[PDB]
Design a protein around this ligand. Structure first.
Ligand SMILES: Cc1cn([C@H]2C[C@H](O)[C@@H](COP(=O)(O)OP(=O)(O)OP(=O)(O)O)O2)c(=O)[nH]c1=O
Ligand SMILES: [Ca+2]
Ligand code: NI
Length: 420
DNA sequence: AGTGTGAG
DNA sequence: ATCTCACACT
């Protein structure tokens, strides 16, 4: 069933207001109440980074000062992420993420895609489950939080699910729609286990590829899951913004919109594959041709040890690193965080990083990074690493006066790679 | 390849 | 993210 890109069952799981839920687990009084998670900033109580769904009803959004949100939601409760060596401390979140990932790994192999989301390949689990119950159909009681995109044509959810279930093939075990339905069953079980063992809620999307799973996950949030079938793709794409498709959120997507004069994914269906290749190249033209028809093949890649570990910090405008002392201090601060993480990495995976990449951005440069250089990473010593990084970046101070740094630095980035 | 692009 | 990480590209 590859010709129609219905060969796999893929799901994407995304935690609802992840940081808020981890905080609600520590301090119970914040549960089922409007609350938020802020990064302490002296001005206005600090910026808000995670908002509960209860608080979103009052118009609360991320990137807005706590006091202004207070005005919008006076009952609003606050949780504050600790700050360390100029950045947020996410140990708590990484550990909760690991908990959930381990729980998901029991049902099918996963691909960790971020701190709060992961792809799941259920093809094998769907086959094995298909043999386990044959002939008896699938009752709606196994899909308490599943939405069937496009149907019908909390009450609506049940009516659409009934219309979906009444038409599912029963005997053809290779039926794409049946495989998706079973995948949604397994995801319902997965999420039930996750809640039971951690108290966390989440959403999921079930379809045939990563792109459709990602779109399906966001259709019915929170604490709900959405199944997007191949037959529902035309309707779903009829008004789906091109820039909302995974990998098309940047320049390529903008280019498609500008060159073809279209806004929705579904409009790409009218162009021929040769036209798309003549305008975007063989590879992107063919990819777009199949993607606008719901076909995509990026495989779900199991456990993978990260290829890099790094951290950085930006110093915009006034904050730009101007003296030599400042650059030395921030390099040391970054290296100390790096050391902490590299140490945990070596403890958990018995591998050591052999290369240190230093990257910096000078004030006034439009590029993301002004330059990058590499040196050996022999010892997990923040002090040593700080001096090595300084040595590769020292040439960049184009000023004979030792009293300052020129041009100033607006970004410092340290990264450990070449693991072995 | 080191840079640029993009997902989260 | 008003950061972490992956990887495509002669
Ligand atoms: C996108 C984003 C996320 N985060 C953090 C906090 C979030 O809890 C975590 C996951 O990010 P998101 O998944 O983007 O958002 P969310 O989990 O808070 O809520 P929902 O999925 O229901 O929309 O990463 C930021 O601090 N700044 C950001 O810009
Ligand atoms: Ca989330
Ligand atoms: Ni020293």
């Amino acid at each position: 069933h590859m010709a129609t890109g219905q060969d796999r069952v893929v799901a994407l799981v995304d935690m609802d207001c992840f940081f808020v839920q981890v905080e609600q687990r520590q301090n119970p009084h914040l549960r089922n109440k409007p609350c938020a998670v802020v990064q302490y900033k002296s001005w206005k109580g600090g910026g808000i980074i995670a908002v509960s769904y209860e608080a979103r009803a009052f118009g609360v959004t991320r990137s807005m000062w706590a006091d202004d949100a207070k005005k919008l939601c006076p009952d609003l409760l606050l949780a504050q992420v600790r700050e360390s060596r100029g950045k947020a401390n996410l140990t708590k979140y990484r550990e909760a993420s690991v908990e959930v990932m381990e729980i998901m790994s029991r049902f099918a192999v996963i691909e960790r895609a971020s701190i709060d989301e992961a792809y799941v390949d259920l093809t094998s689990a769907v086959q094995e489950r298909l043999q386990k119950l044959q002939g008896q159909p699938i009752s709606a009681d196994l899909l308490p939080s599943t939405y069937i995109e496009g149907l019908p044509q909390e009450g609506m959810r049940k009516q659409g699910l009934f219309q979906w279930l009444d038409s599912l093939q029963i005997d053809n075990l290779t039926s794409p729609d049946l495989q998706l339905t079973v995948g949604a069953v397994i995801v319902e079980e997965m999420r039930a286990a996750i809640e039971r063992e951690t108290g966390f809620q989440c959403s999921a999307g079930i379809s045939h590829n990563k792109v459709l799973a990602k779109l399906a996950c966001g259709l019915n949030k929170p604490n709900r899951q959405t199944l997007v079938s191949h037959g529902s793709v035309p309707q779903l794409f009829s008004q789906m913004p091109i820039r909302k498709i995974r990998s098309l959120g940047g320049k390529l997507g903008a280019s498609v919109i500008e060159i073809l004069g279209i806004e929705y994914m579904g409009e790409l269906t009218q162009f021929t594959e040769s036209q798309l290749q003549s305008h975007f190249g063989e590879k992107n033209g063919s990819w777009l041709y199949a993607m606008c028809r719901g076909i995509e093949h990026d495989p779900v890649k199991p456990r993978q040890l990260p290829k890099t570990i790094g951290c950085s910090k930006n110093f915009p405008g006034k904050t730009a690193l101007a003296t030599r002392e400042q650059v030395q201090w921030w390099l040391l601060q970054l290296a100390q965080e790096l050391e902490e993480r590299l140490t945990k990495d070596r403890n958990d995976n018995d591998r050591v990083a052999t290369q240190l990449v230093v990257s910096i951005r000078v004030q006034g440069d439009k590029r993301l990074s002004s330059l990058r250089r590499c040196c050996a990473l022999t010892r997990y010593d923040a002090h040593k690493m700080s001096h090595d990084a300084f040595t590769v970046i020292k040439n960049c101070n184009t000023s004979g006066i030792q009293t300052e740094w020129s041009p100033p630095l607006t970004m410092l980035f340290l990264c450990a790679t070449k693991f072995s």
